[PDB]
């Protein structure tokens, strides 16, 4: 049970994870942008966040960067100077000024036409979200391949499109973490936000505090295989999770929170996933009725495949490209 599925899981993981060549290319891109920035403003710094930073990136990943500056200095000149410099160094793309905040979206140039890099300014909340995810990936070796396999599945099944009514990759990562912390028994992970060792840390009006002294955390008491974990994850969201009523949350000791209790009955609450630090944000706000239908449909198809009576089980079907 799951030994063969586990073998398959790791094989796929090693095929879909970002290659050493691509990683050093992305690192080389980051070093260039940091150079460009250093000449515009020595005191500022360029921080990477998201998948590339936390080690949860698939092949051909895009970049997500953040520029940090003192709050007294009006960004306008620095962000636009940086954009001008990047255009001069061969990148192409957009500068967007929207609601008093600037964003850079680079689209071309290694690094080629393959290049897609989003640059924000003083997006500290995203940095802290990534720090939490990075911490969990350091705590247990099973998490990185589990996340990559789920992201790969969601992309292949066309349920990873927040603009077409389904769910962001970050959403799926939080669904995985919720399952590993609050559903599976024994837990794979403790809840680092609710730990007695957690200290309040207020950043931009939110508490981003969590227990980050990972060295002192004992080994997981869950000894199940990657295959077993995945099998469990698909079954939970296929059958047990009740999206009409319940909220995926990192703020309850037992993981129990209803939409009514939360007060989450164009932001949708069809699928409700409470962001662990920015708790007023529903990461699932992009999911529509038809989108949830397809997401639930694919969880059931995945779970049914993994429990097939027919041998041998066509495990490759799990990552088979869906129509539409």
User: In the chain, where are the structural domains located?
Assistant: 1-17+140-324, 18-139
User: What is the distance between the alpha carbons of residues 231 and 315, in angstroms, rounded to a whole number?
Assistant: 12
DSSP state of 248: B
CA gap 152, 187 in Å, rounded: 24
Contacts (Cβ under 8 Å, ≥6 apart) of 153: 298, 302, 318, 319
**Does 126 count as an annotated binding residue?**
yes
Q: Which helix (H) or strand (E) holds 240?
A: none
Per the document, the length of the chain is: 324
Structure tokens at 8: 């398959």
Q: Is 62 known to sit in a ligand binding site? A: yes
Residues 6 or more apart from 6 whose CB is under 8 A from it? Answer: 225, 226, 227, 228
Q: Is residue 14 part of an annotated ligand binding site?
A: no
Superfamily per CATH, domain 18-139? Beta Polymerase, domain 2 (3.30.460.10)
The position carrying tokens 């998490």 is 143
According to the annotation, is 308 in a ligand binding site?
Answer: no
Method by which the coordinates were obtained: X-ray
Inter-residue contact 288 to 159 (CB < 8 Å): no
The phi, psi pair for 65, rounded to 5°, reads -120, 155
Contact 186, 168 (CB under 8 A): no
Residue found by looking up tokens 């599925």 in the block = 5
26, two tokens: 């992305």
Phi first, then psi: give them for residue 146, nearest 5 degrees: -60, -45
Q: How many CA atoms lie within 13 A of 12 on its CB side?
A: 24
Q: Does 170 carry a binding-site annotation?
A: yes
Q: Is 216 annotated as a binding residue?
A: no
List C-alpha distances in Å: 230 to 206, 261, 298, 308: 32, 30, 14, 15
Helix-, strand-, coil-residue percentages of the chain, each rounded to 5 = 45, 15, 40
Instruction: Write out the two tokens for 36.
Output: 């460009």
Which stretch of DSSP H or E encloses residue 82? helix 76-88
Which residues neighbour 206 within 8 Å (Cβ) at sequence distance 6 or greater?
A: 125, 277, 278, 279
Rounded (10°) CA dihedral 217, 223, 300, 133? 20
The answer on whether 155 is annotated among ligand-binding residues is yes
Fold of the domain built from segment(s) 1-17+140-324: Poly(a)-polymerase, middle domain (1.10.1410)
Q: Report how far apart, in Å, the C-alpha atoms of 101 and of each of 43, 79, 122, 210 are.
A: 20, 10, 10, 28
In degrees and rounded to multiples of 5, residue 69 shows phi and psi of -140, 160
Instruction: Kindly state the tokens that stand for 119.
Output: 């640059």
281 is in an annotated binding site: yes
130 belongs to an annotated ligand binding site: yes
Taking the C-alpha atoms of 295, 297, 300 and 304 in order, what is their torsion angle to the nearest 10 degrees? -130
Nearest to 170 by CA among 258, 270, 93, 281: 281
Distance, first Cα to last Cα, the chain: 33
């Amino acid at each position: 049970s799951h030994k063969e599925f586990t073998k398959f899981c790791y094989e796929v993981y090693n095929e879909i994870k970002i290659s050493d060549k691509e990683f050093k290319e992305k690192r080389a891109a980051l070093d260039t942008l940091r150079l460009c920035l250093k000449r515009i403003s020595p005191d500022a710094e360029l921080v990477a966040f998201g998948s590339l930073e936390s080690g949860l990136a698939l092949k051909n990943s895009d970049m997500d960067l953040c520029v940090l500056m003192d709050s007294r200095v009006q960004s306008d000149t620095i962000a636009l100077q940086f954009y001008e410099e990047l255009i001069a160094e061969g990148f192409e793309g957009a500068f967007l000024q929207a609601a008093r905040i600037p964003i850079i979206k680079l689209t071309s140039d290694g690094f080629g036409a393959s290049f897609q890099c989003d640059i924000g300014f003083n997006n500290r909340l995203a940095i802290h979200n990534t720090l939490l995810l990075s911490s969990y990936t350091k705590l247990d070796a099973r998490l990185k391949p589990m996340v990559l396999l789920v992201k790969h599945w969601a992309k292949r099944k066309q349920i990873n499109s927040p603009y077409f009514g389904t769910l962001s990759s970050y959403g799926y990562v939080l669904m995985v973490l919720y399952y590993l912390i609050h559903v599976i028994k024994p837990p794979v992970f403790p809840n680092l936000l609710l730990s007695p060792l957690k200290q309040e840390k207020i950043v931009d009006g939110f508490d981003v505090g969590f227990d980050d002294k990972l060295e002192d955390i004992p080994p997981s008491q869950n000894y199940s295989s990657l295959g077993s974990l995945l099998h469990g994850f698909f079954a939970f969201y296929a059958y047990a999770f009740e999206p009409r009523e319940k909220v995926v949350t990192f703020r309850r000791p037992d993981g129990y929170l209803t939409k009514q209790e939360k007060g989450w009955t164009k932001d949708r609450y069809i699928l409700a996933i409470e962001d662990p630090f920015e708790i007023s944000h529903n990461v699932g706000r992009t999911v529509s009725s038809s989108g949830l239908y397809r997401i639930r449909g694919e969880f059931m198809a995945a779970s049914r495949l993994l429990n097939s009576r027919s041998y041998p089980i066509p495990y490759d079907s799990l990552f088979e490209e869906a129509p539409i």
